[PDB]
């Protein structure tokens, strides 16, 4: 029903990554279609979807700033950050795994945006 939500899963969700190293990032950024031009920073959330959607309501979120939500729980996450100078592929990424709460924006109970600022 929501294309922004399906698009959120594409850009910001990976259920079970295993190794969350540089090559993890370089591969998934490609697989998820984020390399023309290279997205300069992009973060993936791991685990189940229930926990993530739940950020859109009381169960696992609170209102945050100007129309954003912040999760109550902490998530396993991997931020991929471009390097090397060029905007165009091949896109080299450096991986940073993390564990903390995340900020998103929701519509109709579904996350449609990940605030990347906190992972910078």
Strands (E) across 1-120 are located at 41-45, 61-64, 68-71, 75-83, 92-100, 103-107, 110-114
Question: 7, 12, 46, 83: which one is catalytic?
Answer: 12
Asked if the bond preceding 87 is cis, omega within 30° of 0, the reply is no
In contact, 5 and 83? CB cutoff 8 Å: no
What is the C-alpha separation between 88 and 2, in angstroms, rounded? 30
- Which residue ranges make up the annotated binding site for tRNA? 20-21, 80, 102
Instruction: Give the other-Cβ count within 10 Å of 53's Cβ.
Output: 19
- Which residue ranges make up the annotated binding site? 20-21, 80, 102
Q: Is 64 a catalytic residue?
A: no
Question: 7, 64, 83, 113: which one is catalytic?
Answer: 113
As annotated, the active-site residues are 12, 113
């Amino acid at each position: 029903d929501n294309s922004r939500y399906t698009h959120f899963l594409t850009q910001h969700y990976d259920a079970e990554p295993q190794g969350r190293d540089d090559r993890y990032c370089e591969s998934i950024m490609r697989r998820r279609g984020l390399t023309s031009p290279c997205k300069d920073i992009n973060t993936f959330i791991h685990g189940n979807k229930r926990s993530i959607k739940a950020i859109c309501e009381n169960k696992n979120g609170n209102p945050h700033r100007e129309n954003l939500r912040i999760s109550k729980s902490s998530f396993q996450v991997t931020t991929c950050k471009l390097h090397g100078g060029s905007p165009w592929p091949p896109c080299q990424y450096r991986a940073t795994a993390g564990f903390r709460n995340v900020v998103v924006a929701c519509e109709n109970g579904l996350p449609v945006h990940l605030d990347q600022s906190i992972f910078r």
